[PDB]
From Swiss-Prot:
SUPFAM superfamilies named among the record's database cross-references: Duplicated hybrid motif
Protein name per its UniProtKB record: PTS system glucose-specific EIIA component
Designated gene of the protein: crr
In-chain residues carrying the UniProt-annotated modification Phosphohistidine: H78
Organism: Mycoplasma capricolum subsp. capricolum (strain California kid / ATCC 27343 / NCTC 10154)
A molecular function (GO) term: kinase activity
Length: 154
């Protein structure tokens, strides 16, 4: 239900642990330069959409996915760290830019084992590049399953 307010539920795109941005080894992320949110220690390979919206941001390199909900708030899923460097290697995407997706849809499949050696970190950031409703009332931390609620942007 919705009563004088609508919130945004964010799911986990893979299996693993939700950790904080401060636990991310990258100035841009850990410092929240572009926005806030959290991260994930991918246990699984499949990364799924955290919400429903338009893949407004995608790339040939397949390492980062931008989804814009009907509300305009944009959330960015960014697999690991430095992954742009890989020129799309180990990534098998299933989406294209401008595509509309449903939360829990698969975005891509990452060769985590491979990628994990090539880059500084596979810890994957989830940031809201644009909100307004800029409050994460709750971020569920700890061990999660893909498709679990993990945060509320209320």
């Amino acid at each position: 239900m919705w009563f004088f307010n609508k919130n945004l539920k964010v799911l986990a795109p893979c299996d693993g642990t939700i950790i904080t941005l401060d636990e991310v080894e990258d100035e841009v992320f850990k410092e929240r330069m572009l926005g806030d949110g959290f991260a994930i220690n991918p246990k699984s390979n499949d990364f799924h959409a955290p919400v429903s919206g338009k893949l407004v941001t995608a790339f040939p390199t397949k390492h980062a996915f931008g989804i814009q909900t009907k509300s305009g708030v944009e959330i960015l899923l960014h697999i690991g760290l430095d992954t742009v460097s890989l020129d799309g290697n180990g990534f098998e995407s299933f989406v294209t830019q401008d595509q509309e997706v449903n939360a829990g849809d698969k975005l891509v499949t990452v060769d985590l084992k491979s990628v994990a050696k090539k880059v500084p970190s596979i810890k994957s950031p989830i940031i809201f590049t644009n909100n307004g409703g800029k409050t994460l009332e709750i971020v569920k931390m700890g061990e999660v399953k893909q498709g679990d609620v993990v945060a509320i942007l209320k």
